[PDB]
Amino acid sequence: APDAVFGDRVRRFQEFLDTFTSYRDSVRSIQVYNSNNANILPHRIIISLDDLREFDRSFWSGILVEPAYFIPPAEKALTDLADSMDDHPWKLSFKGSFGAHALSPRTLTAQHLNKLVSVEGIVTKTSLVRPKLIRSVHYAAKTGRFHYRDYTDATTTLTTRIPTPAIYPTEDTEGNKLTTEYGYSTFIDHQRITVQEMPEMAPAGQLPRSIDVILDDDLVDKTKPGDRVNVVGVFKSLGAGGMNQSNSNTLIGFKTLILGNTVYPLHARSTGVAARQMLTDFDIRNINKLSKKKDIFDILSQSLAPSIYGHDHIKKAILLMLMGGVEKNLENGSHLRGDINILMVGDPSTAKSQLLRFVLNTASLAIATTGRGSSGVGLTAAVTTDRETGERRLEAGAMVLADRGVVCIDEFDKMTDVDRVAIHEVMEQQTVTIAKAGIHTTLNARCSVIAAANPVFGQYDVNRDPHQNIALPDSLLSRFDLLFVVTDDINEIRDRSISEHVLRTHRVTIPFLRKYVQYAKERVIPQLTQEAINVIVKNYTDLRNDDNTKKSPITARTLETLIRLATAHAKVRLSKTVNKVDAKVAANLLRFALL
Amino acid sequence: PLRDLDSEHVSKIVRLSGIIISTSVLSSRATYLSIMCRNCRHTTSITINTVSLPRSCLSTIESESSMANESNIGDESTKKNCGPDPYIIIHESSKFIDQQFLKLQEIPELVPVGEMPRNLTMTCDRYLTNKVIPGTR
Amino acid sequence: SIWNSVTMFTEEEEEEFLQLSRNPKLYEILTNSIAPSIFGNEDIKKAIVCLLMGGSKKILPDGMRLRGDINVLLLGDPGTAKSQLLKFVEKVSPIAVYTSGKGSSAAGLTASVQRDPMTREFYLEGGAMVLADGGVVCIDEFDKMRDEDRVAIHEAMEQQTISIAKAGITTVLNSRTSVLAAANPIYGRYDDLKSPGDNIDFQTTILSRFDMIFIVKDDHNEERDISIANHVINIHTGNANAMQNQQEENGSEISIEKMKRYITYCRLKCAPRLSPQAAEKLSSNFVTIRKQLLINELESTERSSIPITIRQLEAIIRITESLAKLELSPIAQERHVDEAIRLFQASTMDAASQDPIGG
Amino acid sequence: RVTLQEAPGTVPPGRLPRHREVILLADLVDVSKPGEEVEVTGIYKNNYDGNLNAKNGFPVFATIIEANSIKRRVFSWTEEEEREFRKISRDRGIIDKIISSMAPSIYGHRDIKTAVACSLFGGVPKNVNGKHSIRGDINVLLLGDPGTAKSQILKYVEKTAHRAVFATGQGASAVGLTASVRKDPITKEWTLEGGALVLADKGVCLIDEFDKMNDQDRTSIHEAMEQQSISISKAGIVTTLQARCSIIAAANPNGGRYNSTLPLAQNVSLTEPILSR
Ligand SMILES: Nc1ncnc2c1ncn2[C@@H]1O[C@H](COP(=O)(O)OP(=O)(O)OP(=O)(O)O)[C@@H](O)[C@H]1O
Ligand SMILES: Nc1ncnc2c1ncn2[C@@H]1O[C@H](COP(=O)(O)OP(=O)(O)O)[C@@H](O)[C@H]1O
Ligand SMILES: Nc1ncnc2c1ncn2[C@@H]1O[C@H](COP(=O)(O)OP(=O)(O)O)[C@@H](O)[C@H]1O
Ligand SMILES: [Mg+2]
Ligand SMILES: [Mg+2]
Ligand SMILES: [Zn+2]
């Protein structure tokens, strides 16, 4: 029956929604889109706990400490507002500062039960999305009428209710037989996941802690295992902890879990989640203005890792790798690569690792690896596992996670043949093939690679040809688009200058650079032009028919590399077509790298 | 010494020394429960400080009011019987605590040769949880 | 460990530490305090003081991290008491792990990952390089260890992070640590007729990583032998247990626990920064050193076994900041640079035993 | 509950040793430990409960023995022995008197026997201001040609010492050399067990065939000898254990025969860091 407190809380939340007007127009926009586009959007809105606190502190604390009494009124108020303002029920999600209610699975104790919490962790295992039966519909042959029934369980609402275990109807009230209508029944999705403490925050040498989460309807497939997730939900207890009946066992307690209502994936270094930013009109105006200056490439290249001295060409190459080219697919089904790869060989104090870590820190999706750190299955994802459902399947590895991203390899020359043969396929076909007992599949691994290695004799020697100093298979070298050789030669003036630069350090910004690269990579797709065609033809002919000794061989991969660099420079320019200037820049850079 | 515990110490207070090797995860137990009978909606409460929920409805033995006697009968001659275990817990209005299990084993140095050591189980709760980690003496 | 430390100090402790800091003889008192039971090796002890103090870390706007720890290597003849220093440093530092190459019995040397015995999930099983985070690792027999450990340690000593990549886990850990390593020459004795590169038993490029190298030789000398013998028999007799220690504790020596607390206090409180005069002096010194090395190399037809790089410049910077810190001064003057350069010349520039260095 | 197995010696040729279960009550508990031969006087009776007779198959019954009396088929002293100790000590030549009394079943090897005496007695540890440790246990190494009674010497040391623990780098041994977390076959409980080094703290560890040892065992020996403490980080357990013990080892030269023309360092496969300790 109606309740006075319930009505008062409903009216108070209605006043809150009246004073704050953003959510009203958000709901109107959702309905407008769903009407116009018939894809359909769900009925859910996000509210600000900070605004709630500023408006009504008592109501704020009520939601925070006793959600079971304060949320359903708000949901009803939102539903009423939507149904009034239009020409399913709606749902709420919470953002803002949770204060002492932001915890981790280790610091989550019984004193938080029945309270709204926000946990952070790493998803360890997801469950299979199964439908749940809500309403059943039946048809009677003898009478030509349709009957129906409804079902519910304990986890569908916050407040406890008296169980009503209705049975599945097979007969009519009079004894007639019934026929089920699968097409007219109603089903809802359902999933369960587990969250664990992050590995970079849990104490070392101690076993981890974990907590279960239940998701329903439209929050059912928002994450994958191995992800960093922040979940805001209601910590709840269910059933009776062996109290009912004798149940002599006293070891077990009360089952607990979180009826999650908000899930957010978080980005982190060497993690499978791509970082994305929201672009404002101010950002777009600034980027578009900056596009028109001639030395844009120079300023952008210099912006990277300003703490390091020189290496201007290497910085340019890294920027080109970050921007990337374009990949082509033909109606036949053939695939043409569009990524770039970089290898650095140098003297043992040339900031190779510093640049590599900078790329790891700045790239939107990058994964870091060392020579012998990961071996065998860890790179190709060729591991096979199984659940208790009995089926075996695969769980992704380094390069598989690195799809559409970057892979940093440090101490490259320490690898082995068994995995260099594997990485050949990744660099060229951009694909991984697995054939084990009961598994025969093919996984996309479109990623770029940057690697560093040391010369055989400790220091690069000019008295010997490049082969004796590098000592890597020519087939492998052919796959790397760019190779650089860097040596430190003692010189009074250079040493002086590097000294002042380093002392200065020991006593365009990166976020804007990231926004720039995101927009450029997402929006612009240039095409080839006859001018560039001719320039690249001439340059490739000359390189293939010159006698100079080069640091790397020459194949058609070099021509494709010219194409990719020209396209990437055009992408930097944000022009819709490649140009003679871009072709010349690519040719100059490759010539410098080879000579 | 952990090897000298025997019958005479049952239910007494003892002092022991050892090394922690394993700590379980925190459990949940109830200290104040609010319960309701699912048939006649008779409510009550329980406080803990092996408690079990009532086996049968208490509204009969508890003659609260004169009108309660009438309410306990209706629809002609059918006697009122709520059934076995008619109570359900209301979780929105209950309080819980923390419980934990530990294992303690003799110092490996003094174990007799040729025999695996002896270990023992311990239970702690409330403010004695999350105080040590395995490997501590 | 770093997860159960204390970051609050009593007022009496703070006042006592301020009074001790104001002492002008604090440096000498600390040097005498480190391992009073060994004879000589004043430069080694001073290097250990600098190591325990540690430098100052910097975070740059672009994200580049300039580490602030110090790495020391002890090449030496057998039985020169170069292991007792390791053990004492372990015992005195607040967070320390002492281990040998190939790890310890049932304890790996680097971060290791395995499935949970119960839940079959990933978790860090151990590893000294991560257990000792924020502290000191005392590596003995540095010349015997596997290549994977070599690579992981090489990444740790500079980037202070360990990158993990496996079939179901990918993350970058934190391993802020200071490395004190001890190794023995091949053939059982250091030979003056061969380069230190040939005396060591691994890639000579590894020597480019450490900030200080101490090559200790066991020369034979009657009076030195007699003095050391007298010291050792005194220690065994126990007279040294009272003399020196129990008297110098009255003003001219520090208790081990008090020194530990003082190190923690200084670490948590102070973080010096250089001055332009020191900067210019350091730059001039570095340029002169590299000019001399280039002259000798161009004169010779071979490359030296002890190269000079920017790592050494940063090591000098870290050492001067370390010396400045223990006085709690928020700035370092050229008086600190003088001592830093003296220590550097004493320790690292024993490369004069290198052939193309001769000249 | 105890299990008694027939003594292997008495079994007639070609058959197997049988076994039975025994029940001990009250003060009869923890009177006999594994590895000793005992005589038990008790009552022989069925497991009359069994489980139940609804089981399929023949109606067979198990039997047990209820123990009434148990008997076995020392280093403490008194004033009478203490006065005799002092009297014997006051005599001259006591050192050689003792040395002549070691391993009487072996002929010669006076240097071996005196070294065993020294290592079996041991010195006194020292610690200056609690910041400079000096060990007091004496280590000996035996390096001899085949057929020299090194194993006999080690067995005598085991039989004579108060706390001696045996181990070997090859062959069957009741204990290994590395600490580990392992299941309990009967109680199904995880247990932390240290190596013979840890188990023999304040005692003596005997190692047979010292040169047939693998990487893990060599690392454990090196750690124990250098630091007298064994670290461990396994199954969420991070800790350190004391391993203050005296080591006696036996080995064989490379090729099975000593080459007197070369230094000892090149006659064995061990390495200086372990040899010097
Ligand atoms: N000097 C000796 N006096 C008496 N018996 C001896 C003597 N030397 C060896 N033996 C006996 O000869 C056999 C040699 O085997 P034993 O294992 O005891 O020798 P070992 O020197 O340890 O050699 P290894 O382990 O290489 O076989 C044993 O029976 C030992 O008792
Ligand atoms: N060109 C440079 N400019 C500024 N600093 C440099 C430069 N080259 C090297 N360094 C310094 O030298 C150190 C080299 O470390 P690392 O990157 O591990 O060496 P490498 O990359 O040669 O293996 C870095 O800490 C860096 O600060
Ligand atoms: N200068 C010294 N002063 C005092 N004791 C010394 C000295 N040099 C060596 N010792 C003695 O040598 C022992 C240390 O030997 P060890 O640690 O094996 O040498 P190393 O560390 O070079 O391997 C100690 O017991 C110590 O008393
Ligand atoms: Mg590097
Ligand atoms: Mg033998
Ligand atoms: Zn009832």
**Structural domain spans, chain C:** 11-352
CA A321 to chain centre: 20
Q: How far is the CA of A351 from the centre of ligand 4 (A)?
A: 6
Radius of gyration of chain D, Cα coordinates, nearest whole angstrom: 25
Is D159 labelled as part of a ligand binding site?
no
Interface membership of A206 toward D (CB under 8 Å): yes
Q: Angle at the Cα of C216 (from C215 to C217), degrees rounded to 5?
A: 120
What sign does the dihedral C333-C336-C340-C341 (CA atoms) show?
A: positive
Nearest CA in chain B to D26: B7
Is C78 labelled as part of a ligand binding site?
yes
- Length reported for chain D: 277
Contacts of A104 (CB under 8 A, 6+ apart): A119, A120, A121, A197, A198, A201
Distance of alpha carbon A212 from alpha carbon A191, whole angstroms: 11
Domain C11-352 bears CATH identifier 3.40.50.300: yes
Determine whether the interchain pair A269/C62 forms a contact, defined as Cβ–Cβ distance below 8 Å.
no
Is A315 labelled as part of a ligand binding site?
no
Orientation angle between helical segments A281-291 and A510-523, nearest 10 degrees: 80
Distance of alpha carbon C209 from alpha carbon A454, whole angstroms: 15
Nearest CA in chain C to A511: C62
Distance of alpha carbon A120 from alpha carbon A114, whole angstroms: 18
Ligand 1, CB cutoff 6 Å, lining residues: D 106-107, 144, 146-152, 252
Q: Which atom of ligand 3 is nearest to the CA of C231?
A: 4
Q: Which atom of ligand 3 is nearest to the CA of C37?
A: 4
Interface membership of D172 toward B (CB under 8 Å): no
Resolution (A): 3.3
Query: Which of D126, D231, D236 lies nearest to residue C105, judging by beta carbons?
Result: D231
Distance (Å) from the alpha carbon of A254 to chain B's nearest alpha carbon: 6
- For the Cβ of C353 lying below 6 angstroms from any atom of ligand 3, the answer is no
Give one DSSP letter per residue of A45-60, joined into a string: EEEEHHHHHHH-HHHH
Q: DSSP assignment, residue D12?
A: P
What sign does the dihedral A33-A39-A43-A46 (CA atoms) show?
A: negative
Distance of alpha carbon B2 from alpha carbon B16, whole angstroms: 7
Structural contact between residues B46 and A246, judged by C-beta atoms closer than 8 angstroms: no
- Largest Cα–Cα separation, chain A: 106
- Largest Cα–Cα separation, chain C: 66
Strand partners, D238: D233
Q: How far is the CA of A246 from the centre of ligand 6 (A)?
A: 19
- For the Cβ of A351 lying below 6 angstroms from any atom of ligand 2, the answer is yes
Is D251 labelled as part of a ligand binding site?
no
- For the Cβ of C311 lying below 6 angstroms from any atom of ligand 2, the answer is yes
**Bridge-based pairing state of the strands D203-208 and D245-251:** parallel
Query: Which of D131, D235, D265 lies nearest to residue C117, judging by beta carbons?
Result: D235
Both structure tokens of C90: 């372990």
Determine whether the interchain pair D233/C240 forms a contact, defined as Cβ–Cβ distance below 8 Å.
no
Residue whose entry in the numeric block shows the structure tokens 């020209």: A566
Structural contact between residues C274 and A506, judged by C-beta atoms closer than 8 angstroms: yes
Alpha carbons within 13 angstroms on the beta-carbon side of residue C261 total: 16
Instruction: List the one residue out of A63, A241, A153 whose CA is nearest residue B89.
Output: A241
| Nearest-CA residue for atom 1 of ligand 3 | C39
With residue D208 as reference, give the H or E element that holds it. Answer: strand D203-208
Is D150 labelled as part of a ligand binding site?
yes
Query: What number of C-beta contacts closer than 8 Å exist between A and B?
Result: 67
Interface membership of A388 toward C (CB under 8 Å): no
Distance of alpha carbon C246 from alpha carbon C36, whole angstroms: 11
Interface membership of D227 toward C (CB under 8 Å): yes
Determine whether the interchain pair C102/D219 forms a contact, defined as Cβ–Cβ distance below 8 Å.
yes
Nearest CA in chain C to D193: C106
What sign does the dihedral A40-A42-A43-A45 (CA atoms) show?
A: negative
Q: DSSP assignment, residue C107?
A: B
Distance of alpha carbon A361 from alpha carbon A351, whole angstroms: 15
Structural contact between residues C144 and C17, judged by C-beta atoms closer than 8 angstroms: no
3-state secondary structure of A1: coil
Instruction: List the one residue out of D134, D132, D127, D130 whose CA is nearest residue C35.
Output: D132
Determine whether the interchain pair C103/D219 forms a contact, defined as Cβ–Cβ distance below 8 Å.
yes
Interface membership of B122 toward A (CB under 8 Å): no
Both structure tokens of A241: 């902890």
Neighbours of B4 (CB within 10 A): 9
- For the Cβ of A253 lying below 6 angstroms from any atom of ligand 2, the answer is no
Optimal mutation site among B24, B25, B34, B91, interface A, most CBs of chain A within 10 A: B91
Q: Which atom of ligand 3 is nearest to the CA of C40?
A: 1
Is C82 labelled as part of a ligand binding site?
yes
Q: D251-254 long-range contacts, Cβ below 8 Å, gap at least 24?
A: D251/D141, D251/D142, D251/D143, D251/D209, D251/D210, D251/D211, D252/D143, D252/D144, D252/D145, D252/D146, D252/D209, D252/D211, D253/D143, D253/D145
Which amino acid is residue D206, in one-letter code? L
Strand partners, B47: B32
* A93, A259, B26, D155 from A116: Cα distances, Å: 11, 10, 19, 69
**Bridge-based pairing state of the strands D133-134 and D126-127:** antiparallel
* A296, C127, C233, D161 from A285: Cα distances, Å: 15, 51, 82, 88
Mutational pocket test of ligand 3: of C48, C75, C84, C223, the residue with most ligand atoms within 8 Å of the beta carbon: C84
Both structure tokens of D267: 């006659």
Distance of alpha carbon D205 from alpha carbon B114, whole angstroms: 15
Instruction: List the one residue out of D257, D264, D261 whose CA is nearest residue D141.
Output: D264
Mutational pocket test of ligand 2: of A345, A354, A408, the residue with most ligand atoms within 8 Å of the beta carbon: A354
Determine whether the interchain pair C91/D265 forms a contact, defined as Cβ–Cβ distance below 8 Å.
no
